[PDB]
A paper describes a structure:
When identified on a space-filling model of the atomic resolution structure of the [name] trimer, it became apparent that two separate regions (which we designated region A [amino acids 231–260] or B [amino acids 265–292]) on each [name] protomer were recognized by the Fab. When we examined the arrangement of the epitope regions A and B from each protomer in the configuration of [name] trimers on the DLPs, it was clear that the Fab could only bind to regions A and B when they formed a continuous epitope at the junction of two protomers; an Fab could not bind to region A and B on a single protomer. The interaction confirmed the quaternary nature of the epitope, with the antibody interacting with both region A and region B of adjacent [name] protomers within a single [name] trimer. The residues on the antibody surface that interacted with [name] (paratope) also were determined by DXMS. Residues 52–59, corresponding to the hypervariable complementarity-determining region 2 of the heavy chain (HCDR2) was shown to be strongly protected from exchange upon complex formation. The light chain residues 25–42 and 85–94 also were shown to be protected strongly upon complex formation. Poisson-Boltzmann analysis of the Fab electrostatic surface show that both paratope regions in the heavy and light chains resided in positively-charged regions of the Fab surface (paratope shown in Figure S2 in File S1). The light chain inserted deeper into the transcription pore, while the heavy chain bound to a region higher up in the pore. There are five epitopes at the Type I channel, but modeling indicates that steric hindrance between Fab fragments limits the number of Fab fragments bound per channel to a maximum of one. The size of the Fab in the Type I channel likely is sufficient to sterically block RNA egress from the channel even if the charge determinants are not essential to replication.
We previously isolated human anti-[name] antibodies and expressed these as Fabs in a bacterial expression system. In the current study, we sought to test the activity of these antibodies as dimeric IgA molecules in a model of immunity at mucosal epithelia. Therefore, the data suggest a mechanism of inhibition of the transcriptional pore is steric hindrance of the pore, rather than induced conformational change.
Numbering used by the authors:
A (entry chain L): 1 to 212
B (entry chain H): 1 to 134, 141 to 220
The structure:
């Protein structure tokens, strides 16, 4: 029926900041809007119900406003336990959730430490080769990794994962894996990982040569 | 004291059906609605529907309407969510939650959630490969070709917790998962210290210890 749009998708903030999150409804949904906090590995926690009402046991720094089509969830001063994803929910007819706004911790830029791992000899026994590229402790999250085999750009044949913000330094880490058959792997000499990141003046390349 | 205990993690073949149970306790069963909400990996919260355990009245999201049936058993104060024609996109954690409706409208209490994984892959313990070290040195463990989730990796039992990153797993084209766990250590240690990853795949009763050498 009625769509819900949340803004922004991603937000960065420091402890004690004031953060504002927005939910826009495609039609008037009046009062019927709730706000949730959701951290990874747990069920959602209800913060605000009926657009403006504070749920019992929720700290006062949380508050909601709006009616009709436009809703705001603000946190007056962000406390370190407040870094989570936030959802709005229509509580009318279909109880549709919004997309979620992820509230992450702001910090100074940090360049990734870059590492390349050739396949191990025991993995090659299996007839598979996996080259792993590690991007360690970087901020902000946005980064770009490129695999180049014999200086030829690779696309669509690697997998990657990113950690959540570290609990102590608030940086991210990323691992990328290029996987080939032992046959293919033995057909090439040079395996390279190119990384561009705003903490880097120019792109960084780590690489190795199979026979060496 | 309030409790919504959900059925344990389940793996189902594509095209099959799943029936997740929600046993409620610690409050009067007929006085609250039960909601079902799911979260597929990398997606946001998705509301599926409601049920009134007083009458058995249901209200579904249109998106799940023909595949999802919710029922209750009042004698056992238990709610059920049945989903048919499961596809890999139905792989998610499924929550049930207790909710008041009408004069006030909110979901106030939540279950622990149930992982349903939808795949044709057979259970399989991981192959563990070393990520050999090449002022600080990184080394690690490539944990390849296991099913299902999850795997735990620790270092040195675990004397080493610092600077460790265990990456979220990826689903490979094979239908098996794969991840890396990396740690940074002093380059000076590579002559003295032996580094072991302790990989534990509980779902297959598999434990692997791989020494990572320079």
């Amino acid at each position: 029926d009625i769509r819900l749009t949340q803004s922004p998708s991603s937000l960065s903030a420091s402890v004690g900041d004031r953060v504002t999150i927005t939910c826009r409804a495609s039609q008037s949904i009046s009062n019927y809007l709730n706000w949730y906090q959701k951290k990874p590995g747990q069920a959602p926690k209800l913060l605000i119900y009926a657009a403006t009402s504070l749920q019992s046991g929720v700290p006062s720094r949380f508050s909601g406003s709006g009616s009709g089509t436009d809703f705001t969830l603000t946190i007056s001063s962000v406390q370190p336990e407040d870094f989570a994803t936030y959802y709005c929910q229509k509580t009318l007819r279909t109880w549709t959730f919004g997309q979620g706004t992820k509230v992450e911790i702001k910090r100074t830029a940090a360049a990734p430490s870059v590492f390349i791992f050739p396949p191990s000899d025991e993995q090659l026994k299996s007839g598979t080769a996996s080259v792993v590229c590690l991007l360690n402790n970087f901020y902000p999250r946005e980064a770009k990794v490129q695999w180049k085999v014999d200086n030829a750009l690779q696309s669509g044949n690697s997998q990657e994962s990113v950690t959540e913000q570290d609990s102590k330094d608030s940086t991210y880490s990323l691992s990328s894996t290029l996987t080939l058959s032992k046959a293919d792997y033995e057909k090439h000499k040079v395996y390279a990982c190119e990384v561009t990141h705003q903490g880097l003046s120019s792109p960084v390349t780590k690489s190795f040569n199979r026979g060496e | 004291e309030f409790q919504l205990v959900e059925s344990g993690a389940e793996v189902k073949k594509p095209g099959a059906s799943v029936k997740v149970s929600c046993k409620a306790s610690g409050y009067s069963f007929t006085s609250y609605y039960v909601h079902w909400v799911r979260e597929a990996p990398g997606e946001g919260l998705e509301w599926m529907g409601m049920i009134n355990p007083s009458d058995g009245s249901t209200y579904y999201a249109q998106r799940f309407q023909p595949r999802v049936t919710m029922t209750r058993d009042t004698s056992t104060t238990t709610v059920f969510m049945e989903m048919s024609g499961l596809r890999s996109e139905d792989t998610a954690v499924y929550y049930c939650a207790r909710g008041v409706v009408g004069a006030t409208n909110e979901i106030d209490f939540w279950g622990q959630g149930t992982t349903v994984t939808v795949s044709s892959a057979s259970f399989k313990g991981p192959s563990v490969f070393p990520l050999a070290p090449s002022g600080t040195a990184a080394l690690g463990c490539l944990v390849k070709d296991y099913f299902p989730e999850p795997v735990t990796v620790s270092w040195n039992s675990g004397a080493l917790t610092s600077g460790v990153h265990t990456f979220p797993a990826v689903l490979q084209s094979s239908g098996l998962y794969s991840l890396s766990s990396v740690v940074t250590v002093p380059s000076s240690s590579l002559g003295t210290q032996t580094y072991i990853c302790n990989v534990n795949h509980k779902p297959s009763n598999t434990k692997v210890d791989k020494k990572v050498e320079p």
